[PDB]
C-alpha cells in the first residue's frame, strides 16, 4: 500500500544542498542592503521636511 522498504545498517542523510543555500544567502544580503537604503532615504526625506 505504498510503504517503502527497509535497509539494515544504513542511515538516510539530510537532503540539503549547499549551492542553493549560498545563493539564497547572497540574494538575502543584497535585498537587506537595498531595503536599508530605502529606509535611509525615506528618513532623509522626513528630516528635510521637518527642517522646513
Amino acid at each position: 500500500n505504498g510503504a517503502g522498504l527497509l535497509y539494515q545498517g544504513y542511515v538516510e542523510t539530510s537532503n540539503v544542498n549547499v549551492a542553493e543555500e549560498l545563493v539564497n544567502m547572497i540574494q538575502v544580503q543584497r535585498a537587506y542592503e537595498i531595503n536599508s537604503k530605502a529606509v535611509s532615504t525615506t528618513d532623509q526625506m522626513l528630516q528635510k521636511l521637518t527642517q522646513l
Partner: protein
C-alpha cells in the same frame, strides 16, 4: 500665493511614488510577482486668465509583464509559464483571476491549489486521487500514479486551463490577482478560452521582475525632487510673511 499648494501637492505625490517603489522593493522575492510601474501625471488648471498653475498627481500603469527569472528546484509540481502565460484560479469572491505563482500544492483530500486558491481546469477545480504522485506535462496534463502500484498505471486525471494575456489589458485587483479590463473582457468574453500555444516547464519556479537599478534611480530622483519642492515651499512662505506687513501703518 497658491504656488505653495502646487509645491506641496508635488511633494505628496513624490511621497506616494516613493511608497510604490518601496512596496516593489520589499516583496522582491515572492514567487510570481509583477512589479508596479509608476509615472507622474500632469493636470493643468485653467480658465479665463493666464493658465500657469499645473498640478501633479502620481499614477501607476498596470504592470511590466517582463517574465521573471526561473530557478530550478526539481520539485515535480512546479510550473513556469511562457513569455505571457497565466494560470487561472478562482478567487475568494468566486470570480476567476490570473497569476504566475507556480507553487502548486495538494491538500489532504486530493485538492490542487495555488496558495489559498484552488486551481481550475476543465469545469470546476481539478481533483486528483487521494495520495497519488502528480507529474505535470509540458501542455498542462496532470498524470497521477498511485503509490505502491506498478509504474505502468500512470493515468491522466485532468488538465490545467491556461490563458494568454498580452499585458496591456490586465489590471491588478485588490488581492494581487490580475483580471481583464472592462473593454478587454467585453471584447473577449467574461471568461477566456484555453489555448494550446502555451507550454509550461516542470521543476522550475519563477521569481519576480523588479529592477534594482530602476529602483535606485527612482529613489534618487524622488529624493532630489522632494527636496527642491520643499525649498520652493519655504521660499514662498518667507516671501509671503515678509510681504504681509504692507497693511500696517
Amino acid at each position: 500665493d497658491h504656488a505653495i499648494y502646487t509645491a506641496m501637492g508635488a511633494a505628496s505625490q513624490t511621497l506616494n511614488q516613493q511608497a510604490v517603489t518601496a512596496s516593489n522593493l520589499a516583496n522582491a522575492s515572492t514567487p510570481g510577482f509583477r512589479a508596479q510601474l509608476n509615472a507622474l501625471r500632469a493636470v493643468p488648471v485653467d480658465g479665463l486668465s493666464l493658465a500657469t498653475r499645473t498640478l501633479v498627481t502620481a499614477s501607476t500603469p498596470g504592470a511590466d509583464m517582463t517574465p521573471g527569472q526561473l530557478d530550478y528546484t526539481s520539485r515535480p509540481l512546479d510550473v513556469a509559464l511562457q513569455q505571457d502565460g497565466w494560470l487561472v484560479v478562482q478567487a475568494a469572491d468566486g470570480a476567476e483571476g490570473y497569476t504566475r505563482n507556480g507553487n502548486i500544492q495538494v491538500g489532504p483530500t486530493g485538492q490542487l491549489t495555488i496558495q489559498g486558491h484552488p486551481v481550475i481546469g476543465e469545469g470546476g477545480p481539478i481533483t486528483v486521487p487521494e495520495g497519488s504522485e502528480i507529474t505535470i506535462a509540458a501542455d498542462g496534463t496532470i498524470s497521477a500514479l498511485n503509490p505502491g502500484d506498478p509504474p505502468n498505471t500512470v493515468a491522466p486525471v485532468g488538465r490545467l486551463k491556461l490563458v494568454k494575456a498580452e499585458g496591456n489589458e490586465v489590471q491588478r485587483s485588490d488581492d494581487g490577482l490580475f483580471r481583464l479590463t472592462a473593454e478587454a473582457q467585453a471584447e473577449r468574453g467574461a471568461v477566456l478560452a484555453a489555448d494550446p500555444s502555451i507550454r509550461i516547464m516542470s521543476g522550475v519556479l519563477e521569481g519576480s521582475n523588479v529592477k534594482p537599478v530602476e529602483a535606485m534611480t527612482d529613489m534618487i530622483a524622488n529624493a532630489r525632487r522632494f527636496e527642491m519642492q520643499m525649498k520652493v515651499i519655504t521660499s514662498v512662505d518667507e516671501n509671503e510673511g515678509r510681504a504681509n506687513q504692507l497693511l500696517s501703518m
